Design an enzyme around this catalytic site. Structure first.
Site, PDB file in Angstrom:
ATOM      1  N   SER A  75       0.921  -1.160   0.068  1.00 62.67           N
ATOM      2  CA  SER A  75       0.080  -0.101  -0.197  1.00 62.67           C
ATOM      3  C   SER A  75       0.817   1.101   0.010  1.00 62.67           C
ATOM      4  CB  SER A  75      -0.999  -0.325   1.605  1.00 62.67           C
ATOM      5  OG  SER A  75      -1.496  -0.888   1.140  1.00 62.67           O
TER       6      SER A  75
ATOM      7  N   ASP B  24       4.433  -8.575  13.679  1.00 63.18           N
ATOM      8  CA  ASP B  24       3.874  -7.920  12.055  1.00 63.18           C
ATOM      9  C   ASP B  24       2.746  -7.539  12.766  1.00 63.18           C
ATOM     10  OD1 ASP B  24       2.680  -6.873  10.102  1.00 63.18           O
ATOM     11  OD2 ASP B  24       4.329  -7.923   8.355  1.00 63.18           O
TER      12      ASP B  24
ATOM     13  N   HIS C 203       6.564  -4.679  10.318  1.00 61.09           N
ATOM     14  CA  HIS C 203       6.099  -4.560   9.099  1.00 61.09           C
ATOM     15  C   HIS C 203       7.586  -4.052   8.051  1.00 61.09           C
ATOM     16  CE1 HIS C 203       3.322  -5.204   6.473  1.00 61.09           C
ATOM     17  NE2 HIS C 203       2.981  -3.652   6.223  1.00 61.09           N
TER      18      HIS C 203
ATOM     19  N   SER D 289       2.135  -7.188   1.808  1.00 60.26           N
ATOM     20  CA  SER D 289       1.151  -6.500   1.913  1.00 60.26           C
ATOM     21  C   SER D 289       0.377  -6.479   1.597  1.00 60.26           C
ATOM     22  CB  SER D 289       1.845  -5.376   3.009  1.00 60.26           C
ATOM     23  OG  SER D 289       0.733  -4.929   3.934  1.00 60.26           O
ATOM     24  N   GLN D 290      -0.598  -5.568   0.976  1.00 57.49           N
ATOM     25  CA  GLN D 290      -2.015  -5.262   0.374  1.00 57.49           C
ATOM     26  C   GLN D 290      -1.545  -6.205  -1.272  1.00 57.49           C
ATOM     27  OE1 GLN D 290      -5.006  -3.355  -2.603  1.00 57.49           O
ATOM     28  NE2 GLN D 290      -3.486  -1.993  -0.897  1.00 57.49           N
TER      29      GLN D 290
END
Length: 197
Positions: A27, A160, A173, A105-106
């Site tokens: 993101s 995370d 993260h 992540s995303q």
């Protein structure tokens, strides 16, 4: 960098790469490779040769919008369409290429959703997939649906929170650089060589 790579969109189907890597950023990240993708890419280029691998980030309609983490599959429908379209380009342009994939992540949610949805004959050509800070790690029990464990490698740091069911960003993260520099490309290279020789 380079944080934008379009080697598949700009790929020569009469001189196909042996290996095609499709990668989705996190993101709010820049280009189509973000912070981790270029480190993976440089290692792939060294292993397969610059002309032996195509590096392709998921750009286009994948906006990497933070709020889309809250949507059902952890990304948007438009993003899934974009990444599916790239897998289809790879399949059509270079049917004998070995594919590899990844996301952060995303982008890890996007890779997982896209791979889940892909026609199985194309999914079956993705020799390995690396996921960093996988936002659906708990929900999907560490897996990509419809895709074998042996071909999957999830990098989920302790602390995370996105790996344990949350969407809150905490310091671990941001600590996937070493993985992107070392064991993630190591795994992809291993899994490609397992099937290609």
């Amino acid at each position: 960098g380079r944080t934008t790579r379009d080697d598949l969109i700009n790929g020569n189907s009469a001189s196909c790469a042996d290996v095609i890597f499709i990668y989705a950023r996190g993101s709010t990240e820049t280009g189509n490779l973000g912070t981790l993708g270029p480190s993976i890419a440089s290692n792939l280029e060294s292993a397969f040769g610059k002309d032996g691998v195509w590096i392709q980030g998921v750009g286009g309609a994948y906006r990497a919008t933070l709020g889309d983490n809250a949507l059902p599959r952890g990304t948007s429908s438009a993003a899934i369409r974009e990444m599916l379209g790239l897998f289809q380009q790879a399949n059509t342009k270079c049917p004998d290429a070995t594919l590899i994939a990844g996301g952060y992540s995303q982008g890890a949610a996007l890779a997982a959703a896209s791979i889940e949805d892909l026609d199985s004959a194309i999914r079956d050509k993705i020799a390995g997939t690396v996921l960093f800070g996988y936002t659906k790690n708990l929900q999907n029990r560490g897996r990509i649906p419809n895709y074998p464990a042996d071909r999957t490698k999830v990098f989920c740091n302790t602390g995370d929170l996105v790996c344990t069911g949350s969407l809150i960003v905490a310091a671990p993260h941001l600590a996937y650089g070493p993985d992107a520099r070392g064991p993630a490309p190591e795994f992809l290279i291993e899994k490609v060589r397992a099937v290609r020789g």
